[PDB]
Every structure is written in structure tokens, then in C-alpha cells.
């Protein structure tokens, strides 16, 4: 999320025991990086 010029990113690695879909469980994503981009963003695309 990018608000007030700051590009908030929250992240979480986690071990899983599954091969199909999103598991039943709870955890959070603490902040990792804040970037003072100050640039509007309206699109994106992932990189494999």
C-alpha cells in the first residue's frame, strides 16, 4: 500500500504443509520496508 508518499510493505515467510490453496491459519505481516516514493501507482505485474 502506498499512502502519503510512503510505500508501505508488510511481509511474512511461513512454512506450509500443503500443495493446493490458502491454509486455515492466522498470522500477521510486520512492516519490512518503507519507501518515500511519492509517486502515484495505478497498475502492477508480477515477475516470475
Amino acid at each position: 500500500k502506498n499512502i502519503d508518499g510512503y510505500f508501505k510493505i508488510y511481509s511474512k515467510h511461513t512454512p506450509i504443509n500443503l500443495v493446493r490453496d490458502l491454509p486455515q491459519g492466522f498470522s500477521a505481516l510486520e512492516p519490512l520496508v518503507d519507501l518515500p516514493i511519492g509517486i502515484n501507482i495505478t497498475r502492477f505485474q508480477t515477475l516470475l
Binding site: 508518499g5 510512503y6 518515500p36 511519492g38
Partner: protein, 48 residues
């Protein structure tokens, strides 16, 4: 004739006059736009 190169060289000898001497020039330009500040000064603390 009437076609002159707009570019010419400095002649720097150590014998040239003090006003005719090389001077390394550093221009420090600052901007403070709506983006957040990113480059600050390392204030030093006291004990606890």
C-alpha cells in the same frame, strides 16, 4: 572566418595569477518539495 568554435580551453599553469588560477567548485543545491525529507543530520545524544 566568422565561424568560431563556441568552446575553448582553460590554460592552467602554476605560474598563472591567483585570479587566473584553478578553483575546484562545489555547488550544493537543495530542494524541499512535498515529498518527505530523506537526507538529515546526525544529532548526538546524552546519556540515559
Amino acid at each position: 572566418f566568422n565561424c568560431y568554435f563556441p568552446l575553448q580551453s582553460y590554460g592552467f599553469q602554476p605560474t598563472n595569477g591567483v585570479g587566473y588560477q584553478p578553483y575546484r567548485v562545489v555547488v550544493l543545491s537543495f530542494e524541499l518539495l512535498h515529498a518527505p525529507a530523506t537526507v538529515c543530520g546526525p544529532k548526538k545524544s546524552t546519556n540515559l
